[PDB]
Design an enzyme around this catalytic site. Structure first.
Site, PDB file in Angstrom:
ATOM      1  N   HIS A  41       0.801  -1.210   0.000  1.00  0.00           N
ATOM      2  CA  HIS A  41       0.000   0.000   0.000  1.00  0.00           C
ATOM      3  C   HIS A  41       0.837   1.265   0.000  1.00  0.00           C
ATOM      4  O   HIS A  41       0.263   2.363  -0.076  1.00  0.00           O
ATOM      5  CB  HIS A  41      -1.028  -0.018   1.140  1.00  0.00           C
ATOM      6  CG  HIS A  41      -0.461   0.118   2.520  1.00  0.00           C
ATOM      7  ND1 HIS A  41       0.221   1.237   2.938  1.00  0.00           N
ATOM      8  CD2 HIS A  41      -0.550  -0.692   3.599  1.00  0.00           C
ATOM      9  CE1 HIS A  41       0.561   1.100   4.209  1.00  0.00           C
ATOM     10  NE2 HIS A  41       0.101  -0.063   4.637  1.00  0.00           N
ATOM     11  N   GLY A 143       3.165   6.289  10.327  1.00  0.00           N
ATOM     12  CA  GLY A 143       4.515   6.142   9.845  1.00  0.00           C
ATOM     13  C   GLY A 143       5.194   4.837  10.236  1.00  0.00           C
ATOM     14  O   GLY A 143       6.321   4.576   9.777  1.00  0.00           O
ATOM     15  N   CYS A 145       4.168   1.774   9.494  1.00  0.00           N
ATOM     16  CA  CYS A 145       3.975   0.664   8.575  1.00  0.00           C
ATOM     17  C   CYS A 145       5.304   0.172   8.044  1.00  0.00           C
ATOM     18  O   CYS A 145       6.212   0.959   7.778  1.00  0.00           O
ATOM     19  CB  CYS A 145       3.097   1.086   7.417  1.00  0.00           C
ATOM     20  SG  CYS A 145       1.418   1.416   7.942  1.00  0.00           S
TER      21      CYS A 145
END
Ligand SMILES: *[C@H](O)[C@H](CC(C)C)NC(=O)[C@H](CC(C)C)NC(=O)[C@H](CC(C)C)NC(=O)OCc1ccccc1
Ligand SMILES: [Cl-]
Ligand code: NA
Ligand code: NA
EC number: 3.4.19.12
Lengths: 305, 306
Positions: A41, A143, A145
């Site tokens: 993503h 942030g 991920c």
């Protein structure tokens, strides 16, 4: 003596964290050999996240659209491909800090260490369990991920988790390093929710053994039970069923302490039915279920890496 | 979202851990630049652990009586000196993995990460707090001595604790990296006991603010308290006194949540009186006191879940 929620030393993983930027999105990547792994993503805009067609979004990208930074050094991307929900960015340099590693998929109830990272920089480390409902109770901000979870064995790092998203109840969902989600979750902004969770019975038992080893014994009693009888109590209190394999795995701790598993189940039975009567166990007023039997043996014997 | 006991990443400290042996005794040392720091009781023998005369024990050692092993490499000791309760071994090699670092002595209530090590090799990392009675509640086995505690705010490692001993209640005592013990303890096996411990009030308040930031308000109430009335109540539950310094330190969390510090004090007063009635706060059924105000700001969002 003492018993703490203990993470693996994180140095071998710290040397693998990088920053990945695509468009306006920055998150973390894992650099092993000549490949950087991150959530797919990263290529999405907010519009895309509502209903992403990842196949279509990826063809529109070129190697120079992925900005990969290892500290203050740009890595040159020379290829890109998708594996399930993970993006794999081939770079022109193998990571010289790549540890001995493998990718593993863990089972619910198993624990692992999380290296929480932001902008490619490790920020903290903590210990988690894969919940029966396939979430983790992490601590993550925007942030995070691409932060990863791992275990260590001798010198081999077993990577088991990559962070992708937060659910409305504040718990977290992610994938293995081959991009397969844990749990019935998808990487799109749609209605999703954690299912009702249960307590990891074999881990509660392991922690009661840790308590006995550390001198906390008030909950022991003269009684024993059977698997069938105890599992009817487990179901009643939304505890996971206890299997014979679980009993076998606890065998070492039973032999060491002199408390048979079904003997300890009789203690847990009584704690579930009666509570703690104002007392604590290893400094907790709740029955802790994020220590595995291996975690207890490992901490109480001082295994190193 | 979420709230965990979060340690600092340990790699910068892992690269400094070595094994030190003198006689039959092996423990851990901390290799920074060309100096290895370790507990001086590595020079003790079994017969003389009650009243060691460390100056007399040390003058009898040569540099080559100290075996220092960094992974698979033996380091050559070329000088030694004692500073308080720490031995400083000068070695012939500067550690190429030495991080940016400093030595800081901490006050009770402060938290830090511990890298528990055996034979110079790391076992695990966890969070601790310096208790009001100058002990820590660690997880340490035989051979853990010389393991260190640290913080890494802003890519500089601040070393604040070196492990030396275990007291009878199962709690732990040690020194700063200048070798001065925390608390009244001595590196002798003469009988010693921790003082009665107390709860770190300012940290409990910080953790209640963390709970509000993360979206929970069930424990608040409509009341307030004076600072003196709060302390008269809290001390009846063996809580440490809350000072104006603590009130000031909680200012930023009070500002982010809109809950005045003395109003949060009134909430804590009621929690001590009532318990949690089957509820939890941030996953705990007890009032947690090993997160500082600085720790909560480090880990929590700057935006409250209103
Ligand atoms: C070093 O690795 C080791 C670490 C412990 C966690 C085991 N430290 C020691 O062995 C230390 C050495 C002395 C010279 C400081 N001794 C102790 O920690 C000792 C307990 C050991 C033997 C398990 N504690 C101690 O002596 O406390 C004082 C005392 C004496 C008598 C009665 C109560 C308390
Ligand atoms: Cl301090
Ligand atoms: Na029993
Ligand atoms: Na000092």
């Amino acid at each position: 003596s003492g018993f703490r929620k203990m993470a693996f030393p994180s140095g071998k993983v710290e040397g693998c964290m990088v920053q990945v930027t695509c468009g306006t999105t920055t998150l973390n990547g894992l650099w092993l050999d000549d490949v950087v792994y991150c959530p797919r993503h990263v290529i999405c805009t907010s519009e895309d996240m509502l209903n992403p067609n990842y196949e279509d979004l990826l063809i529109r990208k070129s190697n120079h659209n992925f900005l990969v930074q290892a500290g203050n050094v740009q890595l040159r991307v020379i290829g890109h491909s998708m594996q399930n929900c993970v993006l794999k960015l081939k770079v022109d340099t193998a990571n010289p800090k790549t540890p001995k590693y493998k990718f593993v998929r863990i089972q619910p109830g198993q624990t692992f260490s999380v290296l929480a990272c932001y902008n490619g920089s490790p920020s903290g480390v903590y210990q988690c369990a894969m919940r029966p409902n396939f979430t983790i109770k992490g601590s993550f901000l925007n942030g995070s991920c691409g932060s990863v979870g791992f275990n260590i064995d001798y010198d081999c790092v077993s990577f088991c988790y990559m962070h992708h998203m937060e659910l409305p109840t504040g718990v977290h969902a992610g994938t293995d390093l081959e991009g397969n989600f844990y749990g019935p979750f998808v990487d799109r902004q749609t209605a999703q929710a954690a299912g009702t969770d249960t307590t990891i019975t074999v881990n509660v038992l392991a922690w009661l053994y840790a308590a006995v080893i550390n001198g906390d014994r008030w909950f022991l009693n003269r009684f024993t039970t059977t698997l069938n009888d105890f599992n009817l109590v487990a179901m009643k209190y939304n505890y996971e069923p206890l299997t014979q394999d679980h009993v076998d795995i606890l065998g070492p701790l039973s032999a060491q302490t002199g408390i048979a598993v079904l003997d300890m189940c009789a203690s847990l039975k009584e704690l579930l039915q009666n509570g703690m009567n104002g007392r604590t166990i290893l400094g907790s007023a709740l029955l802790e279920d994020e220590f595995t039997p291996f975690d207890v043996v490992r901490q109480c014997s001082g295994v190193t890496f």
